[PDB]
Design an enzyme around this catalytic site. Structure first.
Site, PDB file in Angstrom:
ATOM      1  N   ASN A   1    -112.216 -54.922  30.225  1.00  0.00           N
ATOM      2  CA  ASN A   1    -111.591 -54.244  31.148  1.00  0.00           C
ATOM      3  C   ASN A   1    -112.118 -54.244  32.628  1.00  0.00           C
ATOM      4  OD1 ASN A   1    -109.939 -53.426  29.072  1.00  0.00           O
ATOM      5  ND2 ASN A   1    -110.870 -51.365  28.653  1.00  0.00           N
TER       6      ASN A   1
ATOM      7  N   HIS B   1    -118.551 -54.924  29.416  1.00  0.00           N
ATOM      8  CA  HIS B   1    -118.848 -55.105  28.056  1.00  0.00           C
ATOM      9  C   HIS B   1    -117.723 -55.523  27.383  1.00  0.00           C
ATOM     10  CE1 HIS B   1    -117.058 -51.302  29.194  1.00  0.00           C
ATOM     11  NE2 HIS B   1    -116.246 -51.051  28.381  1.00  0.00           N
ATOM     12  N   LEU B   2    -117.890 -56.549  26.262  1.00  0.00           N
ATOM     13  CA  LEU B   2    -116.863 -57.169  25.527  1.00  0.00           C
ATOM     14  C   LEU B   2    -116.372 -56.198  24.326  1.00  0.00           C
ATOM     15  CD1 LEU B   2    -114.777 -59.782  25.115  1.00  0.00           C
ATOM     16  CD2 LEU B   2    -117.073 -60.277  23.572  1.00  0.00           C
ATOM     17  N   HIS B   3    -115.081 -55.618  24.181  1.00  0.00           N
ATOM     18  CA  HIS B   3    -114.703 -55.188  23.091  1.00  0.00           C
ATOM     19  C   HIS B   3    -114.276 -55.896  22.018  1.00  0.00           C
ATOM     20  CE1 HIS B   3    -113.790 -50.952  24.939  1.00  0.00           C
ATOM     21  NE2 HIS B   3    -113.836 -51.525  26.083  1.00  0.00           N
TER      22      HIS B   3
ATOM     23  N   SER C   1    -113.940 -47.945  31.312  1.00  0.00           N
ATOM     24  CA  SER C   1    -114.415 -46.659  31.243  1.00  0.00           C
ATOM     25  C   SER C   1    -115.934 -46.633  31.469  1.00  0.00           C
ATOM     26  CB  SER C   1    -114.273 -46.312  29.664  1.00  0.00           C
ATOM     27  OG  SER C   1    -115.095 -47.249  28.749  1.00  0.00           O
TER      28      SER C   1
END
Ligand SMILES: Nc1nc2c(ncn2[C@@H]2O[C@H](COP(=O)(O)O)[C@@H](O)[C@H]2O)c(=O)[nH]1
Lengths: 115, 112
Positions: free
Chosen positions: B85, B98-100, B93
């Site tokens: 994101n 960061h990679l989800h 957020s």
């Protein structure tokens, strides 16, 4: 034929038309034919890799390059409020074309969860 | 500025750590959106993908390779979705890139 005969391999070889945003020796960025956001494009390697689950360790730079090109194209396309990058892996991931690709979606508020 | 992910990297607050090396950390999301939902983050404090430098290319790809290996180790043999994101439209957020990785259920379309 280098790149294989998925739809994306044929787009890479200019055998099927696409709306291309950016192209270099390692990847191709082009708009999605079924956009899920006001701007929705794909960044794909020219090297054929079926899915992220079979990518090799030495593919690290190439995969990162998809994200760098994705964020540069997003800026070039004026997505100044942000965007979402997505890789769909396999059946549970919703994958439908087995040639690795990064989705980039923007131009609206994206929601959580991401599907 | 620092974020809660910086505190997690520094081991100042707990998280359910899956994998660590010299340049990234993978850990379960505290607010999981799927039966398996974890994050892979660089130890380098890159605030958001839009400011990543060209020299970061292989590091970003390393997040994805670590993510796909952790996904296999967590039994995600039917697949998964990876998400990054950016900014407010992207729903980012935490301003630490960061990679989800989400799986263990059918992921749907559109992806939010
Ligand atoms: N530009 C373009 N996109 C396509 C074509 N065929 C499929 N796509 C797109 O490729 C994407 C495949 O991603 P997947 O579903 O595998 O994550 C879908 O969003 C789909 O709309 C095509 O012929 N041209």
């Amino acid at each position: 034929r280098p790149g294989g005969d998925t739809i994306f391999g044929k787009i890479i070889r200019k055998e099927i038309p696409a709306k291309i945003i950016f192209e270099d020796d390692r990847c191709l960025a082009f708009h999605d034919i079924s956009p899920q956001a006001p701007t929705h494009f794909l960044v794909i390697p020219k090297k054929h890799i079926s899915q992220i689950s079979v990518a090799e360790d030495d593919d690290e730079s190439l995969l990162g390059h998809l994200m760098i090109v994705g964020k540069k194209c997003a800026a070039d396309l004026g997505l100044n409020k942000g965007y979402r990058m997505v890789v769909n892996e396999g059946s549970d991931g919703g994958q439908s074309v087995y040639h690795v690709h990064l989705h980039v979606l923007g131009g609206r508020q994206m929601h959580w969860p991401p599907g």
